[PDB]
Amino acid sequence: WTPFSWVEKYAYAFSGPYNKAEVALTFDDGPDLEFTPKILDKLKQHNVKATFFLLGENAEKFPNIVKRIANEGHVIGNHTYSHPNLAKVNEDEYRNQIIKTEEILNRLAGYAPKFIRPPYGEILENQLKWATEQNFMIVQWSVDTVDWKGVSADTITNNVLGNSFPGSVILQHSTPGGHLQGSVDALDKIIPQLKTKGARFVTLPSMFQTSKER
């Protein structure tokens, strides 16, 4: 496990350009019935676009919300189908997880997502090698809100503001049944407080200067 050398060899990154006043909000495990729509509303009222790493199985349950994300100028990423620990699966299962999810999202969003994020951040080198060869890009994160723990909006905000830099990729969740209300509320503080420091919010394809589609 050498994640550092992997950024030099594969399409793989934790954060973005240090010389741009830009950060990226990302949200994992969507879509869902409660948190995803709330997040969309708050992103809308702050005039920011974000990136959504959607689970294939959740996209099947709520297909229209996937359509809403795309219709509101946000970028969709591939978060596998059923959220398994990729470090424990064989190549066939890994490729199946990605491709099945890609087909689902392509049908709903109108394009095949270029961006992948592995569940728990677990990825193997051969998996990363295949993704690179298939014209994917894998992006982890550099600021973890640990919002799944049910921590408050103030805790998340102080965390994000204390650890965010130019190029920072922030991790939040919109998992069905998750304890994430404070994470949603955190956006009302995180966004303007970062903007005050000169930060602008961008999508991943913008941050990494590539297409959103494969």
From Swiss-Prot:
Enzyme class: hydrolase
Source taxon at top rank: Bacteria
Binding site for Zn(2+): 29, 79, 83
Cofactor(s) the record lists: Zn(2+)
GO biological process: carbohydrate metabolic process
UniProt-listed Enzyme Commission number(s): 3.5.1.104
2-hydroxyproline: modified positions: 119
Post-translational modification: Hydroxylated on Pro-119. Hydroxylation alters the active site and enhances significantly deacetylase activity, probably by creating a more favorable environment for transition-state stabilization. It might be autocatalytic.
UniProt key word Zinc: yes
pH-related activity note: Optimum pH is 6.0.
Activity control, per UniProt: Deacetylase activity is stimulated by hydroxylation on Pro-119. Inhibited by CuCl(2) and ZnCl(2). Inhibited by the hydroxamate N-hydroxy-4-(naphthalene-1-yl)benzamide (NHNB).
Catalysis: reaction(s): peptidoglycan-N-acetyl-D-glucosamine + H2O = peptidoglycan-D-glucosamine + acetate
Residue positions of the active site: 28 (proton acceptor), 173 (proton donor)
Temperature dependence: Optimum temperature is 50 degrees Celsius.
Similarity-based family: Belongs to the polysaccharide deacetylase family.
Protein purpose: Catalyzes the deacetylation of N-acetylglucosamine (GlcNAc) residues in peptidoglycan. Also acts on soluble chitin substrates and N-acetylchitooligomers. Acts on cell wall peptidoglycan from the Gram-positive bacteria B.cereus and B.subtilis and the Gram-negative bacterium H.pylori. Not active on acetylated xylan.
Protein name per the record: Peptidoglycan-N-acetylglucosamine deacetylase BC_1960
The organism of origin for this protein: Bacillus cereus (strain ATCC 14579 / DSM 31 / CCUG 7414 / JCM 2152 / NBRC 15305 / NCIMB 9373 / NCTC 2599 / NRRL B-3711)
